[PDB]
């Protein structure tokens with residue numbers, strides 16, 4: 042189960058990754074989550090990534106390819122893996138193809154989760170995360186019982202630094218410009234599958250399960 046989840050910022054990649062990883066027991070490899078964890082602890086990966094992440098720009102290829110190479114080399118990826126938000130450039134895609142061909146693997150599906158830009162803007166600006174447990178909420182789409190507070194543990198919710206409207210707009214632009222060529226690269230291999238991300242979370246997952254259960 043060698044899978045990539047691709048989509049504009051906000052499309053639900055992390056939401057579906059958690060589902061796939063829970064059901065199929067394959068590692069969750071999210072470059073965004075890896076950068077963010079590094080930035081929080083101020084490691085040298087974090088420091089180098091931070092300026093790009095704050096600006097809504099893509100971290101440079103070599104760095105990104107590096108953390109993915111290191112991650113794939115671990116023994117938990119022998120049965121499959123879920124790459125969430127990588128690749129994001131055609132250079133990353135070609136690098137990955139090379140890494141996997143040496144590992145005697147190929148990508149089985151690249152899943153493009155499609156959502157209109159107005160709802161993406163709303164998803165990102167309204168997302169809130171628990172500072173205690175990391176549970177994600179949304180102001181309108183899945184609100185806590187008490188505003189600003191986690192249902193599970195009473196912890197105070199926070200907003201990511203890049204989820205403000207200005208930086209969301211830049212993120213959408215930056216990622217949309219990369220997208221057509223990346224889609225084409227995978228469509229030419231005929232491994233690209235498009236899923237309508239405007240469905241509820243379980244119905245999106247059900248559409249993914251209809252293909253992934255074959256692996």
Ligand SMILES: Nc1ncnc2c1ncn2[C@@H]1O[C@H](COP(=O)(O)OP(=O)(O)OP(=O)(O)OP(=O)(O)OP(=O)(O)OC[C@H]2O[C@@H](n3cnc4c(N)ncnc43)[C@H](O)[C@@H]2O)[C@@H](O)[C@H]1O
Nearest residue numbers: 050051052053054055056072073094098099100164168242
């Ligand atoms: N390969 C690469 N190369 C270069 N640089 C890289 C890189 N990868 C990362 N980076 C750098 O790292 C930065 C951070 O990347 P990253 O952290 O990966 O951010 P992103 O791709 O912009 O998207 P998000 O995590 O914000 O969105 P998501 O699609 O995971 O949606 P989520 O499920 O959270 O959902 C969003 C919200 O919507 C809600 N939602 C989800 N599904 C649904 C649904 N079905 N209906 C309604 N609401 C839903 C959720 O509850 C939540 O509130 C990048 O901007 C870049 O600088």
Ligand SMILES: [Ca+2]
Nearest residue numbers: 238239240241
């Ligand atoms: Ca919807």
Ligand SMILES: [Mg+2]
Nearest residue numbers: 054055073074
């Ligand atoms: Mg994410």
Ligand SMILES: [Zn+2]
Nearest residue numbers: 171174191194
């Ligand atoms: Zn919590």
